[PDB]
Design a protein around this nucleic acid. Structure first.
Ligand SMILES: [Mg+2]
Ligand SMILES: [Mg+2]
Ligand SMILES: [Mg+2]
Ligand SMILES: [Mg+2]
Ligand SMILES: [Mg+2]
Ligand SMILES: [Mg+2]
Ligand SMILES: [Mg+2]
Ligand SMILES: [Mg+2]
Ligand SMILES: [Mg+2]
Ligand SMILES: [Mg+2]
Ligand SMILES: [Mg+2]
Ligand SMILES: [Mg+2]
Ligand SMILES: [Mg+2]
Ligand SMILES: [Mg+2]
Ligand SMILES: [Mg+2]
Ligand SMILES: [Mg+2]
Ligand SMILES: [Mg+2]
Ligand SMILES: [Mg+2]
Ligand SMILES: [Mg+2]
Ligand SMILES: [Mg+2]
Ligand SMILES: [Mg+2]
Ligand SMILES: [Mg+2]
Ligand SMILES: [Mg+2]
Ligand SMILES: [Mg+2]
Ligand SMILES: [Mg+2]
Ligand SMILES: [Mg+2]
Ligand SMILES: [Mg+2]
Ligand SMILES: [Mg+2]
Length: 117
RNA sequence: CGCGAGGGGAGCCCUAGCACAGGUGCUGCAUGGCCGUCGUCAGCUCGUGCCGUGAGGUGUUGGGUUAAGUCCCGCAACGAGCGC
């Protein structure tokens, strides 16, 4: 059921701003706009979710991100819809690499929670 | 130490020798301290992270505002320290 539903409203986008690398996943080009190979997506979808489901049962925590507005809140709801960590709230420098100093901002939010109740 | 003779010790004083004092003599280019100054100027940096072979850069820049690096929004940065 995954297939046609993608063709539902989830393929083809952009034009003349692509990247030759991505070209292998491309199918054609109508109206000047690029048409993505729907059938090939399906394959990558399988391999991906294999890892997704795997790391899920492994109990891993996935970090979701998308500051882009056209996916702003969609990242939000789906996040609590799994308890999985995430940030579409505009990314930051050292989110992961400087996770130490960043997490201190959290420990400060905890303290604010302390006076918030 | 004795009844007293007399002698002797502390102290202080002078005379004597020695140890040593004393110096507003030099060096602020050997120094502490304190003070003047740019300046009551908004400025000067640290930790971590990222960029760079490196000196270093980023933050501290940008837009708004203030007496002000004041605050705000923004931002590969997140905070913090001596400063207002
Ligand atoms: Mg803080
Ligand atoms: Mg006698
Ligand atoms: Mg006698
Ligand atoms: Mg006698
Ligand atoms: Mg006697
Ligand atoms: Mg007698
Ligand atoms: Mg007598
Ligand atoms: Mg006599
Ligand atoms: Mg006599
Ligand atoms: Mg005598
Ligand atoms: Mg005696
Ligand atoms: Mg005399
Ligand atoms: Mg004399
Ligand atoms: Mg002299
Ligand atoms: Mg001096
Ligand atoms: Mg002032
Ligand atoms: Mg530090
Ligand atoms: Mg450092
Ligand atoms: Mg350096
Ligand atoms: Mg900062
Ligand atoms: Mg500076
Ligand atoms: Mg600088
Ligand atoms: Mg900048
Ligand atoms: Mg600023
Ligand atoms: Mg300013
Ligand atoms: Mg930001
Ligand atoms: Mg900033
Ligand atoms: Mg301040």
């Amino acid at each position: 059921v995954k297939e046609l539903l993608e063709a539902g409203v989830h393929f083809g986008h952009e034009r003349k701003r692509w990247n030759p690398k991505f070209a292998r996943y491309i199918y054609a080009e109508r109206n000047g706009i690029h048409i993505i190979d729907l059938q090939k997506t399906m394959e990558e979808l399988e391999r991906t979710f294999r890892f997704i489901e795997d790391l899920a049962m492994r109990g891993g925590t996935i970090l979701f991100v998308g500051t882009k507005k056209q996916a702003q809140d969609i990242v939000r709801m789906e996040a609590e819809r799994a308890g999985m960590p995430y940030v579409n709230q505009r990314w930051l420098g050292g989110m992961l690499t400087n996770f130490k100093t960043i997490s201190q901002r959290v420990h400060r939010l905890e303290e604010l929670e302390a006076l918030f109740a």
